[PDB]
Amino acid sequence: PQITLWQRPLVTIKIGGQLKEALLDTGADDTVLEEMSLPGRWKPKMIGGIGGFIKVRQYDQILIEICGHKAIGTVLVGPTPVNIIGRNLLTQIGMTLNF
Amino acid sequence: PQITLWQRPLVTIKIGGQLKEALLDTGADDTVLEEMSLPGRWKPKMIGGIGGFIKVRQYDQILIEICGHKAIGTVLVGPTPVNIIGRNLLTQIGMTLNF
Ligand SMILES: CC(C)(C[C@]1(c2ccc(-c3cnn(C4CC4)n3)cc2)NC(=N)N([C@H](COC(=O)NC2(C(F)F)CC2)c2ccc(Cl)c(-c3ncnn3C(F)F)c2)C1=O)C(F)(F)F
């Protein structure tokens, strides 16, 4: 499919038993989700964007259902104002920019 | 052309007659550039949400060329991690996400 950019490109994902709305974000290196429970070990990280930085927990090897795919990747969990699918997952579903 | 997402989608832009590197950012509503001089008057805008908010200068109807595609639109100037081409200009150049 083709997703135009007249509006924020939002999709529904399934992760950790939960459904979430998230933004397809080519400006994000990694996926960042609002606070939620995830399995496995994690390590703290600081991530920067407009306005400064927030502290998040980094989980690796997380399965996310998105755009008809089952993709594996890193998920950062913390006080993000929006759920974000970053490039680390976008590549796995074959998403590209085209013009 | 098609741009994959294994690396940051950095491209060359031209603004004010000068070449700069900028990030094609589907997660950005707006285009925000590192400090530079632009013509005319500006108006205030507040953007952000990652650890805080930043004041930026908003300039309207600015000529900016992105990968050879000429656009004219709103450019914000302020303290951004890197020059960002947001959806306001990605739409002008016909950019979409595809999978
Ligand atoms: C992954 C990050 C970087 C977060 C981030 C994001 C996206 C959407 C919202 C969002 C949407 N709705 N809401 C509100 C309703 C609740 N919040 C909030 C944050 N995603 C993204 N692409 N951008 C860029 C900056 O990206 C970068 O710096 N990239 C990097 C590169 F430069 F190196 C990696 C640094 C950007 C530029 C210019 C603008 Cl105007 C906007 C923008 N559009 C809308 N709001 N904003 C706001 F941010 F100003 C975003 C982000 O800041 C991270 F890491 F912080 F989480």
Describe this structure in words.
2 copies of one chain form a homodimer. The first copy, chain A, is mostly beta strands. The first copy, chain A, has one domain: Cathepsin D, subunit A, domain 1. The first copy, chain A, contains 1 helix and 9 strands. In chain A, strands 2, 3, 4, 5, 6, 7 and 8 form a 7-stranded mixed β-sheet that branches. In chain A, β6 (about 50-65) and β7 form a beta hairpin. The longest helix of chain A has 4 residues, at about 85-90. Chains A and B meet through β1, β5, β6 and β9 of A and β1, α1 and β9 of B. Bound molecules: the ligand CC(C)(C[C@]1(c2ccc(-c3cnn(C4CC4)n3)cc2)NC(=N)N([C@H](COC(=O)NC2(C(F)F)CC2)c2ccc(Cl)c(-c3ncnn3C(F)F)c2)C1=O)C(F)(F)F. Ligand A1AAD sits at the interface of chains B and A. Chains A, B: It is a lipid-anchor. Chains A, B: It is found in: Host endosome, Host multivesicular body; Virion membrane.
Cα radius of gyration of chain A in angstroms: 13 Å
Kindly report how far apart the N and C termini of chain A lie.
Answer: 14 Å
Strand-pairing-aware structural class of chain A: mainly beta
Helix content of chain A: under 10%
**CATH architecture identity of chain A:** Beta Barrel
Task: Determine the CATH topology of chain A.
Answer: Cathepsin D, subunit A, domain 1
Total number of helical segments of chain A?
A: 1
Write down the CATH class of chain A. Answer: Mainly Beta
Compressed to H and E, one letter per element, the order of chain A equals: EEEEEEEEHE
The percent range for strand residues of chain A is over 45%
Heterogens: ligand A1AAD
Number of extended strands of chain A: 9
The oligomeric state is homodimer
The CATH homologous superfamily of chain A corresponds to Acid Proteases
**Largest β sheet strand count, sense and barrel closure of chain A:** 7 strands, mixed
Biggest interface reads: A-B, 38 and 39 residues
Globular, elongated, flat, extended or rod-shaped: what is the shape of chain A? globular
Provide the number of structural domains of chain A: 1
Keywords (chains A, B): Aspartyl protease, Host endosome, Hydrolase, Protease
Membrane topology (chains A, B): Lipid-anchor
Protein name (chains A, B): Pol protein
Subcellular location (chains A, B): Host endosome, Host multivesicular body; Virion membrane
